[PDB]
Ligand binder design. Structure first.
Ligand code: HEC
Length: 108
C-alpha cells in the first residue's frame, strides 16, 4: 500500500493517550464524545448507529482502509472539512503506522 505495519503495542498506547478520551474499540463498547470504533475497516464513515455524526462526516462517505485512515489521521479537519473531531493530527507517519497497526488489530 502506502502504509506499512508498525507496532501493535506501540499503537495501543498511542491510542490510550491520544484517542480513548473520546473513543472505545471493543465490540459492544459505548459511544462517548466520538463513536465506538469496532469494525470500522471496510465500513463507510457515519454508519455506527446510535451516534450523531456531523453532516460532513456523513457526506464524505469514506470507505475506511488502513490507507484512507492514514490520510485522515494526519489532519482530520483537513480530510473532512467540518468534522467535530477536535484532534490535531499525527504528523509522524511512523505514529500513524503504529496507531493504525493497533486499530486494525483491535477493531476486528
Ligand atoms: C475527542 C476530542 C476525540 C479524539 C481525541 C479523537 N476523536 Fe475520533 N472522533 C471524535 C468525534 C466527535 C468524531 C465524529 C465526527 C463527526 O463529524 O461526526 C470522531 C470520529 C472518528 C472517526 C470517524 C468515524 C466513522 O466514520 O464512523 C474515526 C475513524 C476516528 N474518530 C478515529 C480517531 C482516532 C484513531 C483517534 C486518536 C488519534 C481519534 N479519533 C481522536 C472525537 C475524537
Amino acid at each position: 500500500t502506502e502504509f506499512k505495519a508498525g507496532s501493535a503495542k506501540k499503537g495501543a498506547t498511542l491510542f490510550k493517550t491520544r484517542c480513548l478520551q473520546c473513543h472505545t474499540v471493543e465490540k459492544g463498547g459505548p459511544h462517548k464524545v466520538g463513536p465506538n470504533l469496532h469494525g470500522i475497516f471496510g465500513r463507510h464513515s457515519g454508519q455506527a448507529e446510535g451516534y450523531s455524526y456531523t453532516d460532513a462526516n456523513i457526506k464524505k462517505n469514506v470507505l475506511w482502509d488502513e490507507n484512507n485512515m492514514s490520510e485522515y489521521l494526519t489532519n482530520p479537519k483537513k480530510y473532512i472539512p467540518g468534522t467535530k473531531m477536535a484532534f490535531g493530527g499525527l504528523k509522524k507517519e511512523k505514529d500513524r503506522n503504529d496507531s493504525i497497526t493497533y486499530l486494525k488489530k483491535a477493531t476486528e
